[PDB]
Structure formats: C-alpha cells, structure tokens
C-alpha cells in the first residue's frame, strides 16, 4: 500500500486509488497470459476503457478530449501502469507521451483535430518512430531519405524497434529531407503517418527477451506518399522537435521501473511473512530485513526524485539532464531490486509460475531501451561542460 | 548553484541564500584551519552570530525567541552548514535539534522558560548523552544508574561519544532509575544536567579521523546531585522520550551527507574545466562525464528524498523507518560520491591542500554516527514484520 | 581466447581445446534451439558421446572406465560445456558430481560396480534429491520418511527441484528415517533409487526462466520398496555424506558462471568491432572500454580464484568456506557481467535472436541454485566463529 | 593466517612468515607514529636491515648480491610490507621495482655495476620521475628539456609526485632531449640523476591525506650537468623503457591493496568476536557475517588473481592489460573492504586511535598514485582494439 509521503495532493491520491482499483480484475489478473503468449487479446478494449477515464489525455486539455492536468499526474498514472502488468506499461507511454503530447505541444490547429480526437478517446493507437538499425544511439545519423515532388513527400528507407508497430494507427516518423547539409541536426524533419497509406507496411513482430506484450516490429517504406500538410513542426528544423519529446519521454517513462519496484515489493513482503525456514519466517532474518530495507529505500529515493522533477516541470522549469538522470537512476535501481526480489524467493523466483523472472526481464528494458545509460551520461556531461 | 527542483517556497529560498553568503565568509574560509587544528576558537562567537540569525531555534516556538518554522528549514540549514564545514554542521545539529526539540517536545512549562531563551540566543550550548563506551547501538543496555536520595537524584556512570561535551552548558542525560523491572526499557529516565554541577566533569577531547574541530569527550558523573525538577518527561518514561528524539535526529542530520555531497560537486566540477590532459580538458572525457553524471543524479535523488520525507513529518505523519532509511541512503551515497570526487582530482586530491580528503573523512561519520548503518536496516525490517 | 596465465598443464590445455572443438561442432549451433524448445532430443546420444570421451567419469577411478583426473579438469570441462550451452552444463554438473562423484567417495564396492560403469559410459543418467517443496534451504528439516521393514525401506513423500529427474536412471535420494531423534541432523539417510521400482513416479518438467532443456520435475514416493543394499553412507548418519557432497558440488559448479562469462565476452568483444556509431566503432568509446575492462577483470579474477581453490582440493586442502565463497563470488560476478554484456549490444541484447538474453537467465540460477546466496554468506560467517 | 590455496611452493611460504615476524617485531608497532608524524626517522636503518635480509633487489639477477627470484616473491613481500605499514609499502615499491628494475633490464654493464651495489644493500634510495605538475596521466607530454653540449646534458625543468624525493641519492628522471620530433614519445630519454650534482635541489615534503611517512616533494633542475655515461637505454628511445616498466610497476604495486585489506580483516575479525551487543558477540549477527564473507571473498579473489598473474610473468608471458587490471581490481576492492572494516568497528573505528582510519587513506593512493582507474581501463580497452 502506498502512502502520502510521495507528496501527492488529494486529487492525485484519489486518482492513484482509482487506478489501483481499476487496473485490478481487469489488467493484472491477466499479465501472466500476456507474458506467456506475447499477445494482448483485449488490447483495444482496454484502450477504450482507459480512454473513458481520461488517462490517455492526462496532459492534454479537455478541449480535445483530455483531462488538462500536468506531467506529475502523468508520471503518477504511469507508475500504477506497468505495476499490475509491466508488459502493457510501454504501450501507454508510447501512445500518450510519444504521440499524443508530441502533437499537442508541437502541432498546428489543423493536425490537432484529425488524429488527437481519435488518439485521446482510445479509438486510434499512437506511436513514435525515430530509431533505425544503423542509428539506435546516434539519432542524428539517419539514412531514411525524403524527396520532395510537389505537395507530397515520398519516404524511402527502413526503421527498427518501433513500439506499438503492428497496431498503431498514427505513427510519427522522422525522416531526413536534406541528406547533403553539413549540420546533421538541420536535415531532420518530422512527419505524421496513418495506417493504410500506400508504400507503408509493417514487418513481423519481434520476440523480445522481456516486456512481451508491447508489440514491436520493423517499418518498411517503399515509395510512400504523405501530403505536405502532415509535416510535424517545420521542414529542415526537426532538431528541436525531436529532442523535446525525448526529454518528456525520459521524464514520464521513469515511472515505469517505479511500478516494477512497487510490484516486486508488493510480491516480496507478503511472501517473506508466509514462508518459514529453520523454524522461523524468512522475513525475520537480518539478511532478508536488509534486502527489504535496501529495496524500500531505493524505491522511495527513485520515486520522490521523479515526482519532484515533474512538479518542477509543471511550472516552466524543464531540463533534459534531470529527465535523463531520473530514468537512468530508476532503471539502475529497479534492476538490482528485481534481482533481490528474485533472490528472496529462492527456487520459486526462477520458474515462470511467479512474476519474479518477468519483472527482471521487464526491468532490463529501461536500461537499453528508450535511450541507453551511456547516452544519458554523455548528455549530462555535455550539459555540465557547457557552463 | 542549487536548482528549483526542491520545490521550496520563497521564504525557504531566502534562508538558503542568507546562510550561503554568511558561511562563505565566516565558516568556509576557515574550514581547513578548523580541520587541521581540531579546535574551533570562534565557537561561541559563531554560535552567538547564528543565534542572532535565528537558525538555532529554527524549530522552536516564537515564544522563547525561536523562529517557529518546520523541519525542512532546519534540514536545509544543516545541509548548507555541512557544505560550508561538515565538522561544524554536526555540532550545530547535535546542539540545536537534540536539545531544543527534546526540550520543547517533553519539557514542562518551567524547564522551557528556564533554558530555551539562552539556548536559542547562543549563550548556552546543548548536547545529548545517550551513548556509552559499552553500548553504541544497544542504547537500552546503558549502565548509568540514578538513585533517589529524597528529593534528589544521584547520577553515577559515564557517557561517551557526546558532541560538544566540554562546550555544552545544558545537557540531556538519560539515566536508569529502576533496574528490577522485567522490561529493560522501563527503567531509563531522562534528566537535565547543567554545566558546573557538583560531580559533573569532562575527561578530555578525543581525536577522530574526520569531523575535526567538533569537540567530543567523555562525560563523568561522580555523585552528581541533580534536582528532581530537572527531570525531562515523566518518571520511568525516558525510552519514549529517547526513541521519539532518536527518530527525529536521523532526519535532521540527513543534510550532513547532503551538504558534503553538494560540496564535493561544487569543488570537483570547476576543477575538471581547468586542468587539461592529452591536449584537452579532462572534463570532456567520457569516463569523467559518466562519474559526474552519476554523482549529480545521486546527490539530487538523495536531496529530493530527504526534502520530501521532511515535509511529511511536518504534516503530522512521521515514521521511524523512513527517518533511518533517508540517513542511511544519504550517508552511503555521500561516501560513494566522495570516493569518486577524490579520484577526479588525481594526485591533487590526495593532499590536505584540497578539502576532498576532509569531505571523505567527514562522510564516513554518518554511517557510524547517529545510529548504525546495520541497525537502521534492522529497524526498517522490523516495521514490515509488525504488519 | 584463453590465456596461459591460468596456470594449467599442457594436458589440461589439450583437454580444454578438445572440449572446445567437440562442443562447437555438436552443441554450440543447437544451443539456442534447446533453450527455445526446452527439450534435448539428442540428450542420450550426446551423453553417449561424452561417455566415449571419458568426461562423465573424469573424477571417477579408471577401473570403472573413468579418466581418474582431478577436480581442476572437472571444472575445466564444466566451464567448457557451460560456454556453449548453460543448460547442458548444469546437466553435466548434476550428473558427474552429484551422482558419480558421490558414489566414489561414500559408496561400497558393489554399489560402485553396479552403477558407475553405466553412469560413465552414458547408459544411465544420475540425479540428486535434497530439496523439498517445504524445505529448500533447511535441508535438515526434510520430512521424507524412510521407515523400514525387514530388509527393505518404505519411502513415502515428495521432493522438489530434482535436476535431470525424468531422464535419470540412477538417483541418490536423501531421506529421513528417524524423525523423533533429538539431533535433527543425525536422522537423515541416503538411498540409491533407480528407475523401475514400483512407486517411483516422476512428474512433468518445470518451465523456468533459464536453463531451458534441463528436465526438472517433482519426485513422488508412495510405498516404494528400496533394498537394504542401495544405501549410500551409513544408516541414520546421512548428514555427513550430504554435507560432503554439498561442499564439493559448489566447487565444480563454479565453472558454470565462468563459462557463461567467457561466452558473453567472446560474443561481445568481437561485436563491439563490427558495429558503428558516430562514424567510429563502438569499441573505441571510453565507456565501452571501461565496460570491457570491468568484465575481463572480473572474469579473470573469478577464474583464477576457482582454479587455485580447485588445485588446493587435489592435495587434501579442502574447505567448505572457500567453496561457498568461490561459488558465491562467481555467481555474483557472472550476474553483473551478463547484465553489462546486454548493454554493450544495445538493442540486439533484448531479443531471443541473440544468445545474450539466454546467458543472463542462466546465470541467475547460480545465485539461488545449489544453496541460496545468503546461506553461503551464513556458512562463511559461521566458519570464523570457531577460531 | 594464510592458506596453501595460493599455490606458494617451497622457499616462498617460509619467506612470508619470516617477513611477517620481522615486520611485527620492527615495523608493526611503528606504523601509527609514522602516520602521525608524517615522517620515518628509522628509514636508513630499516633499509639497511631490508638489504641485509635480501628482500631489496629481489628481482635483480645474482651478480651484485641480489636474490634472483621471480616477481611472485616480490609481490608477496610488498603485500606483507603494506600489511604491516601502508606508508612504507609505497616507498618499498618505488625503491625495489621503480628504480632497480629499470637498471637491471635496460641498464648496461658499467651502469648497473656502479649503483646496484650501493642500492641493493640499502645505502642509496631509488626514486622515479615520471609525472609532472602539469602532466599527471599524460606522461609523454613532459616538458623537461635536455640540451646536448658535447658529452654533457643540461636539464632545466621541474617534476612532481616524486616518491622518496629528498632521500634518494640516485633518481631515474626522464627528460625530453628532442622537442621537435613528429611523435611525442620519441623525444623522451631516461637519465640517471645523482644527489650532489650542481643545479639539483628538492622542495619541502608534501602533506598528503594518506601514506603519511613516505617522503614526496618537488624536484628542481637548473643548469644540471648530466654526464653522457649516465644515460639509460638509448637516446630518443626512453618511451620503450618507461612504457615497458610501468606495467611491471603496476603489477608489483598491486600487492599493496592486498596487504592493506589483509590487515583490515586481521583487525576486524577479532574485534567482531570480542565486542558484544544485544547479549551476544556482534560477530554472530547475519549482517556482520555477510560483510565478513564479502570481504574475505574479495580479498582471496584479488590475491589469487595477482599471484596467478605474477606467476605468468615469471615464465616470460607479460601483458600490459593484465598488469593494470590486477592493480585496478585490487584497489577498487580494497577501498570497499576498508570501508566495510571501518563500518564494522562502529564508533571506535572513527577515531585515530585505531589503525582502521589509516587503512582507508592508504587504500586511496593505489587508485591515483599508480595511474588512475580511467587510464587503466583505457589501457585495457586499447588491448582489444589492437586485435
Ligand atoms: C518522444 C521521443 C523523441 C522519445 C524517444 O524515445 S527517442 C530516442 C532514441 N534514439 C537515440 O538515438 C538516443 C538519443 N541519442 C542522443 O541523445 C545522442 O547523444 C545525440 C544527442 C543524438 C548525439 O548526437 P549529436 O549529433 O552530437 O547531437 P547534439 O547533442 O549536438 O544536439 C544539439 C542540437 O539538439 C537540440 N537540442 C538539445 N537539447 C534540446 C532541448 N532540450 N530542446 C530542444 N532542442 C534541443 C539543439 O537545438 C542542438 O541543435 P544545433 O545547435 O546542433 O543546431
Ligand atoms: C551528533 C551525532 C553524530 C549523533 C546523534 O546525536 S544521534 C543518537 C545516536 N543513535 C543511537 O545510538 C542508536 C540507538 N538506538 C537504536 O539503534 C534502535 O533504537 C534499536 C537498538 C534497534 C532499538 O531496539 P531495542 O533495543 O530492541 O528496543 P525496542 O526497539 O524493542 O523498543 C523498546 C521500546 O522503544 C520504544 N520505541 C520504539 N520505537 C518507538 C517510536 N517510534 N516511538 C516511541 N517509542 C518507540 C518503545 O517504547 C519500546 O517499549 P516497549 O515496547 O517495551 O513498551
Ligand atoms: C548441480 C545442480 C544441477 C544442482 C544444484 O543446484 S546442487 C543442490 C545442492 N545444494 C542444496 O540443496 C543447498 C541446501 N543448503 C544447505 O544444505 C546448507 O548447508 C544448510 C542446511 C542451510 C546449512 O545449515 P545447517 O545445517 O542448519 O548448519 P549446521 O551448522 O547446523 O550444520 C552442521 C552439520 O554439518 C554437517 N557436516 C558434515 N560434514 C561436513 C563437512 N565436511 N563440512 C561442513 N559440515 C559438515 C554435520 O553433520 C553437522 O550436523 P551434526 O550432525 O553434527 O549435528
Ligand atoms: C607511486 C609509485 C610507486 C607508482 C607510480 O607513480 S608509476 C606511474 C605514474 N605515472 C602514470 O601513471 C602516467 C602513465 N601514463 C600512460 O600510461 C599514458 O597516459 C597512456 C595511457 C599509455 C597514453 O599514452 P599516449 O600518450 O597515448 O602514447 P601511446 O599510447 O601511443 O604510446 C606511446 C609509444 O609507447 C609505445 N609503447 C606502448 N606500450 C609499450 C610497451 N609495453 N613497451 C614498449 N613500448 C610501448 C607505443 O608504441 C608508442 O610508440 P609511438 O607510436 O609513439 O612511436
Ligand atoms: C549526541 C551524540 C553524538 C555522537 N557523535 C559521534 C561522533 O561524532 N562520532 C562517533 O563515532 N560516534 C558518535 N556517537 C556514538 C554513536 O552513536 C555510535 O558510534 C554508534 O551508534 C554505534 O557505535 P558503537 O561502536 O558505539 O556501537 P557498537 O554496537 O559497538 O557497533 C559495532 C557494530 O556492531 C553492529 N551491530 C550491533 N548490533 C547489531 C545487530 N543486531 N545486527 C547487526 N549488526 C549489529 C553495528 O552495526 C556496528 O557495525 C555519538 C552519539 C551521540 C549520542
Ligand atoms: C614515482 C612516482 C611516484 C608517484 N607517487 C605519487 C604518490 O605517492 N602520491 C600521489 O598522489 N601521486 C604520485 N604520483 C603522481 C601520480 O602518478 C599521478 O598523479 C597519476 O598518474 C595521476 O596523475 P594526475 O592525477 O596528476 O593526472 P590528472 O590528469 O590529474 O588526472 C585527473 C583525472 O583526469 C583523468 N584523465 C586523464 N586522462 C584521461 C583520459 N584519457 N580519459 C579519461 N580520464 C582521464 C584521470 O583519470 C583522473 O581521473 C607519482 C608519480 C611518479 C612518477
Ligand atoms: C540436485 C538438486 C538440483 C536442483 N536444481 C535446481 C534448479 O535447476 N533450479 C532451481 O531453481 N532449483 C534447483 N534446486 C533447488 C535449490 O537447491 C533450492 O531452491 C535452494 O536450496 C533454495 O531453496 P528454497 O528457495 O526452496 O528455500 P527457501 O527457504 O524457500 O529460500 C527462500 C529465501 O529464504 C532465505 N533464507 C533461508 N534461510 C535463511 C537464513 N537463515 N537467513 C537468511 N535468509 C534465509 C533464502 O536466502 C532465500 O532468500 C535443486 C536442488 C537439488 C537438491
Ligand atoms: C519511439 C521509440 C521506441 C523504442 N522502443 C523500444 C522497445 O520497445 N524496446 C527496446 O528495447 N528499445 C526501444 N527503443 C530504444 C532504441 O530502439 C534502442 O536503440 C534499442 O536498444 C535498439 O538498439 P540499437 O542496437 O539499434 O541501438 P543502441 O541501443 O544504441 O545500440 C548500439 C550500441 O552502440 C553503442 N554506442 C553508440 N554510441 C556510443 C557512444 N558514444 N559511447 C558508447 N557506446 C556507444 C551503444 O551504447 C550500444 O551499445 C525505442 C526507442 C524509441 C525512440
């Protein structure tokens, strides 16, 4: 059970309680089938249910269908998410933060009414596309060329590791319109892709080590046709557009490993008080007590950091350095906390009948996915050397 | 050099910068001298100057000349003083908190009026006497006993590890008044001991690896005739007074590790931007940028943790688990950050001309001071075993 | 490429090269399919091929068809087999040490002549039964009753976590004959059961996070008739063979983590030179170089530790504390090395298409299998309380 | 004590006990005073005794009174010396391996015949000059010029971090005779500087954080006439000596942290059994036992690694990667071992009355005094990029 020490207001505590009472019996009781089969049978039904509660538009205003709240509520609702089921935790972050908010913050009035009323209401699924096989860390070195032939841009190339690939209806794909410019950041341009366009196609879904349930595949572009009105931001100026959502991504996705740590704690604490060894409960031994103390301290340290950074972001003070730091620290702590939680179960933490191994495989994503720790360390270093 | 992520109000921000300009001219330039001489010559003058600023009774009510603020302001002042000088910060905390809070929470109407004015004004120094040479963590096994000689208490025994021993004019000493009770805790009772009483003396100031300049000695009680009116709390109720102050001293002293971890960064970052190696500044190498990023993220996480836990205790919801967890995490992270901060200076960090060695030696105290790193995990674990 | 720094004889190097050549042709390509399907159809054929090489009874006397080599060569073979497939390595460790090495040290002449030749030639598979569903770490608290009538023992009860269960032909099952004895340790008796006895029914295989391909099932004994000649050790004093087997099983099993670290290094080090980022190979970045340095140093330190401890056991300098220490250190280092190896690949380490995901799930077993990691710390700590 | 696990053959184990007894009867009761006064009054007598005992010049061949043994004996002697007194360990390492090894390897017949007879017996002190005030890690960027005038070399520059500066009678100082070469490494040249030459002087001793007692000061060169016969190796080829000797220096100095953490454990283990709390010895609690297990495992692993690497170099298999890796791992482990040892003592470990405070300060030198960990990881990293 979570306490009010996190600094949440009455409305935020009520929202957390509502998420806790709603995710149970609907999501969590079926995270083990999703993990075993890597498929969500009622994904669209669950998305429609989420759209009714307004969690998809937690940051978007009520004008377009959202709730009109801040990023603190987003990082809060993304901690309840991925807690009951870590599998579907990445899909919500890729839908709301990566696609909806990107159109809300850097979109025009025309584009802000065709896709967002569909995405916020859960009718369509959104996703972001920047990575590619030749550029997974060096995002400014893309190879997808975009040639102009009037009022339509033809995308040609290939991208990899696109979250929610086979099921997203609106995809924000970044492409290079000027591959001959000396500054690599001046050639990138954002585009809006909709399912059913000619030339666009999705490849086979990947069988990832962990986080199975969040669909991911390969995008193939062969003589595409996107109108000029679907350009997100401005042409040859996608540098600030790209590296603005990547910061809110690190800020909001930091709640992911927080939910994983909360889940492994809610699964570890009762188990240590029911399992007995050497005539006593295993929870009374000093080593298990120290493990629980370390896990609780790490969770409480990672939870207050992200929440305070989100509170600072909701007033005008934003920094990519802190947004990367909170998520890298959360992932680095969650990996060790999942390791300790598997260690506390012994033999039972190894079989697939317990979510111990699942939470371990899920925790490893945030360290390599959505930006590796090396990239974040280099960003913090460059931010420290600039001053 | 701090950031607004802490979420402190404008009034709390004023106290942050007020102590910043004061300590950098009154305490910072003499930190090396206090460390190498192990004697604060201006101790009483600095205490009176701080009492003029109102930071001593910052948690005391406004009736006795205090400030009336909360624990967060005391924590931030402690952090600033520890950043200026870790040795003086420990003494400031162990005086202000461990005397004024203990007197206002359990002292009667007469004891508060008698001692608090001159304690807040800086004329009287305070200290807490709970540890013993044979009982550091096991405080319930103390050997100091008290016997009722009519309307008087004859205290016999010794106390060890007392901060500001020879300097404190009013000291809170716990003494066992009964030994026939089945529970060992039911015999401990708190007493107020003044300086100069018959039978009270100090042996000698001891030398420590770190925190040099903070006076610590051994208390010797030889038939000390403490009056019955100097009893703190009630008869045979000292453990409830001790454990209450024990949980609060861990939260307040958390700024010490925070102050040291802020000072190592304030001294390290400007150094990497000056020294050059292999034809470029050392701050541009990835191995240094990664360490700087790790240290900054750890410092910010610990600071947000402490600041959020402090706010919860002012609302009226305090726990003993969180108070031990925050200080344990802060001490460990400050030690691990100072370890890298000394290495970042290379050969220059291994000499006494730079305060990095002092920052490292002062960081180890909070892992073996104000409790123990091992007993904190035990207290945290026993909280889950009781639920 | 292994270095001669390990301090091995020429014959040991030749054996290592022969094992590397044999496993690369027969086991290395199909290593991924065994993990994907959790089945080894060529198990008996591969076991026969190993028996033709003499590595199954490498620690057994030559009179039974074994090689008569020391524990160092056994650790070498374990590291080589775990280098290609971790599950096959665990199976070989459970076969050659838990069953074969147990009979040569505490079995009679007839019991050895009856079982060892088929176990060495690959005809019979060996297994050990210590763990129980209600006693995983506290093996002394086993409840398997072994009451006897005449010249037969009536075993009744279930045991869990039996490696090579469904495929084993000769199994060593520890049972408790006298449950009312005051000494809890002096009530265990080891019995040598075999496939075909009425009442020995094996359960289905267990799906686990790693080591896929090793058949682990629950044994069920219901009024089985075990002859009085199939007794390992002495009656009512089976605790001594149980701890003698436990002290030496942790030494040979240390090659598992060593083989996994060798595999992840031989997969990462070449991969860092055939991957490009920012116009350069990823292996030239200082952070990746530091990761390589840490992984190489940890692998080398653990390997030298295990080798020097194994060589000491060949001259009678055995110690349970050293074996627990080496197995704990090897598991803890292999876990971190497998975690770091995935980060070096980036995204290509989070999919089943690359073996980086398999080696991590297999390395986690060594921290909970064959004794919990905390139990190892307790065993090591109790070894200093008697000096 | 020690175990035969290290594989120490005859004439090596007896030397260990001999050194232990010698240092416990001579050096052990003086380490505290050496660390306190930052000086070693009995330096010349100690060096004479070491020369008479045959430990000085252990690696030197048997021509001038050397022992002619392998590096393993030197490693264990350095380990024992650092275990007795860490401050004297750095001086012994700089004397026996930093100076003598360069003389026996690259020194010609007439050169080594003049200095070694007066250097092995303990008369002269052997110092080394590589780093500079503006070049700590970038040793090839030295600015010490050496102009050639007939058969005389005139050096004009400054050095820093010179161990045993004012006491050394012969100093191997690298000078850049050609500042106009295309490769920066081809310009440096090693020269044998002797005390008493005109234009040579030394500054006052440095006040370091740790290693108090090992003299270190700045070297001053002003028109110092160096004879042409005092050249080491060949002209413009000084890099092929410095780079080839720095690996052996890092290898031999790796025994320092080994003996440091050995003394840490030898002081911690009896204290955990004598000190009692909560009605029993503190050494019986699970946390203390786990810390003891971790420290013992780390010490044994590092010792076995260093010994196995030293055995390889005795057979003619030297590598630059392993020599840096072993000392890096040893220092990084000894730091944490000293931290845990200080933690296990509690409050008593914080005062300078116990040697636990010196162990932490001495362990930090091997991370910055023998090349930083970053440079070591870079050297290890570059070893893989060359394949
Ligand atoms: C919502 C979505 C985007 C979330 C995701 O999950 S996407 C991430 C996955 N792909 C990746 O490649 C990992 C990210 N990669 C990195 O961070 C790399 O370290 C790179 C930054 C790309 C390094 O490549 P490099 O060519 O050196 O790029 P620079 O560092 O020099 O970029 C400087 C230019 O970026 C822009 N920028 C930086 N910070 C911000 C900001 N807070 N808001 C808006 N714009 C920003 C800035 O305008 C600058 O432009 P120029 O001065 O170069 O013209
Ligand atoms: C300046 C600087 C460097 C240092 C400082 O000034 S800080 C002071 C130094 N700190 C210390 O020495 C640590 C001493 N204490 C401890 O470590 C812990 O308190 C423990 C040793 C784990 C206490 O354990 P133990 O001896 O078993 O005693 P118990 O826990 O069983 O408690 C017995 C009685 O404790 C009292 N207690 C415990 N928690 C609280 C609470 N949250 N509020 C009020 N009272 C509490 C409680 O009354 C209990 O009594 P009963 O249950 O018998 O009725
Ligand atoms: C290979 C792979 C596929 C499969 C695997 O995973 S291997 C599976 C095997 N490993 C396990 O099952 C782990 C189980 N863990 C353990 O057994 C632990 O040792 C513990 C049972 C927790 C130890 O706890 P506990 O027995 O209560 O501690 P005690 O001090 O009371 O034990 C004393 C008894 O030790 C026994 N002992 C006999 N020989 C030795 C010997 N040469 N060295 C050390 N101990 C020995 C001795 O019998 C004594 O009991 P008493 O009869 O004297 O009372
Ligand atoms: C307290 C006391 C007892 C212990 C001490 O204080 S000892 C050491 C204190 N001083 C230091 O740690 C600084 C040492 N500095 C370094 O090692 C450097 O920073 C390096 C990481 C090697 C970087 O050197 P860098 O400037 O990049 O130059 P290079 O790496 O290209 O090498 C220069 C030339 O050396 C050659 N070299 C490298 N290794 C060896 C070898 N094992 N034997 C013989 N020659 C070698 C290499 O070929 C190169 O030649 P050129 O290509 O320039 O012609
Ligand atoms: C106002 C005040 C100021 C102080 N200032 C200082 C100061 O500046 N410097 C200073 O050094 N000390 C100071 N002390 C003393 C400090 O409280 C003790 O040093 C500390 O609590 C424990 O150290 P110890 O050696 O005295 O206790 P010990 O109990 O002897 O500690 C020894 C070790 O035993 C371990 N241990 C004990 N019980 C258990 C258990 N059940 N399980 C596992 N491990 C256990 C502890 O963790 C510790 O590692 C101060 C005390 C007071 C009251
Ligand atoms: C005989 C001898 C004895 C010595 N004895 C001592 C002694 O007793 N005590 C002592 O303190 N010193 C001693 N020194 C000096 C010591 O060897 C140097 O201080 C050491 O090499 C590190 O140098 P620096 O810190 O001055 O280099 P710096 O450049 O100051 O190092 C600062 C930081 O820069 C980093 N850095 C440099 N290059 C890179 C890179 N390419 N990538 C990433 N990071 C980098 C370093 O890693 C380090 O973390 C001695 C030197 C010699 C020659
Ligand atoms: C031949 C054989 C082969 C096996 N093969 C496998 C295999 O392939 N895979 C597999 O998963 N398992 C295997 N096992 C089971 C494995 O040995 C047990 O899982 C292991 O001993 C731990 O058991 P447990 O988790 O059931 O014990 P539990 O008691 O359930 O352990 C749970 C937790 O309690 C803690 N604990 C217990 N006592 C103490 C104490 N005194 N202090 C502190 N903490 C304590 C442990 O550290 C652990 O964290 C095998 C067993 C045998 C006999
Ligand atoms: C919208 C979106 C969705 C995503 N979804 C997922 C997902 O569902 N699952 C997932 O795992 N990931 C996801 N990612 C992360 C991204 O796909 C990662 O790049 C992923 O790990 C694929 O890796 P890669 O091998 O293509 O690139 P990388 O992860 O970068 O791998 C390349 C390797 O090169 C090295 N390298 C490159 N430059 C440097 C340097 N300067 N210093 C040191 N090393 C360097 C790396 O650190 C890394 O080891 C997503 C990213 C985005 C933007």
Author numbering:
A (entry chain D), B (entry chain A), C (entry chain C), D (entry chain B): 6 to 392
Original authors' sentences:
Isovaleryl-CoA (coenzyme A) dehydrogenase (IVD) is an intramitochondrial flavoenzyme that catalyzes the conversion of isovaleryl-CoA (3-methylbutyryl-CoA) into 3-methylcrotonyl-CoA in the leucine catabolism pathway, transferring electrons to the electron-transferring flavoprotein (ETF). Consistent with other ACADs, including short-, medium-, and long-chain ACADs, IVD is characterized by a tetrameric architecture composed of 4 identical subunits. Each subunit of IVD contains one noncovalently attached FAD molecule, imparting a characteristic yellow color to the purified enzyme. Dysfunction of IVD is linked to isovaleric acidemia (IVA), a rare metabolic disorder characterized by the accumulation of toxic metabolites.
To elucidate the complex structure with its substrates, an IVD construct with the E286A mutation was expressed and purified for cryo-EM preparation to minimize conformational instability caused by the process of enzymatic reaction. Upon incubation with isovaleryl-CoA and butyryl-CoA, complexes of IVD with both substrates were resolved at resolutions of 3.35 and 2.91 Å, respectively. Following the addition of the 2 acyl-CoAs, the refinement process revealed additional tubular densities in the active site that ran partially parallel to the riboflavin portion of FAD, which were well-modeled as isovaleryl- and butyryl-CoA. FAD enters the pocket through a space formed at the junction of neighboring monomers, while the acyl-CoAs adhere to the surface of one monomer and enter through an opening on the opposite side, allowing their fatty acyl portions to interact with the FAD ring deep in the pocket. D284 and M280 form hydrogen bond interactions with adenosine at N6, while S222 and R223 contribute to interactions with the 3′-phosphate. These interactions confirm that the CoA on the outer part of the pocket is close to the monomer, while the remaining portion extends into the pocket, riveted by S174 and R287 from opposing directions. Although IVD can catalyze dehydrogenation of substrates ranging from C4 to C6, it exhibits the highest activity for isovaleryl-CoA, a C4 straight chain with a methyl group at the Cβ position. At the bottom of the active pocket, where the fatty acyl portion and the FAD ring reside, E286 extends its carboxyl group to approach the Cα–Cβ bond of the substrate to abstract proton. G406 and A407, located at a critical loop position in the middle of the helix, provide suitable space for the insertion of branched chains from substrates. Comparison of the 2 acyl-CoAs in terms of binding revealed a twist alternation at the fatty acyl portion, potentially attributed to the additional side-chain methyl constraining space within the pocket.
